[PDB]
Amino acid sequence: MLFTVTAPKEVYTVDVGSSVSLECDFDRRECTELEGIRASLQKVENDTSLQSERATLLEEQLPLGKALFHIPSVQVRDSGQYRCLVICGAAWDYKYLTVKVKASYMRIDTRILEVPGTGEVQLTCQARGYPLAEVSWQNVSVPANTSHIRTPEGLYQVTSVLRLKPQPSRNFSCMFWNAHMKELTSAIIDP
């Protein structure tokens, strides 16, 4: 039989904590025998394509020529390459699908501290998100020190610390640029 599978969407970008429904369409006129259809999803890891235990096939879409695989509350460990596989009788086909994940650097914790001795102030912004953000401080010529760690859930915790002599009536704004996702977020610190 002339059985093929197509993937209407090759790359899915998903917010951490939200679901994804990965789709592959298949040829129903060459697989009229809906009884012997076997649709499955595999995640590729260590160059090994093993069946996914996160995804559920929404089998109510099968009669319509659509294999839809639902993954709830997507995490960083769910990102990467998948294969949707459909077997109908003595024929099969598959397609690759990529899941990219995102977590907005939306909660930014701030701190202000006076640095004893120096007369300087120390200002800190810290936020978790995904992929790795860069931080800059708006209209400040003094360089900050920015670093990151990974959280147990796979996010980046990015912390930026600026130390300087505080200027009169001046607020300081730290700006997180999540480049891969084209998102800017920011917090204002009033000393």
């Binding site: 039989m1 595999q42 394509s49 077997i87 003595a90």
Partner: protein, 114 residues
Amino acid sequence: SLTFYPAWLTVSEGANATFTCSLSNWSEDLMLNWNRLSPSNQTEKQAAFSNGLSQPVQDARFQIIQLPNRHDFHMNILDTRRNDSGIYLCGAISLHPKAKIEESPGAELVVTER
């Protein structure tokens, strides 16, 4: 384990080109597909071999012939055209409840003018 070779092949248009897909283990439940990669590296099925029969998807110039040792297969493109130039691979799965998609490395075809 699958190999697909020669890792690159160059022929003039009109030539009947051959890649060999070689399996570490053949059994008659296996279904063998010959795929082509798209510009975004998506797989696209060209032809299949199962139950002793080669079945092209949409172009009958794509033929799969199982060789007498049952493990090696000739993946032939008859009457090559410039538009056949690209990357190809073979893939196999069994009909078994627990089956992994197995793929060979890619191999490149370049079909030149005249």
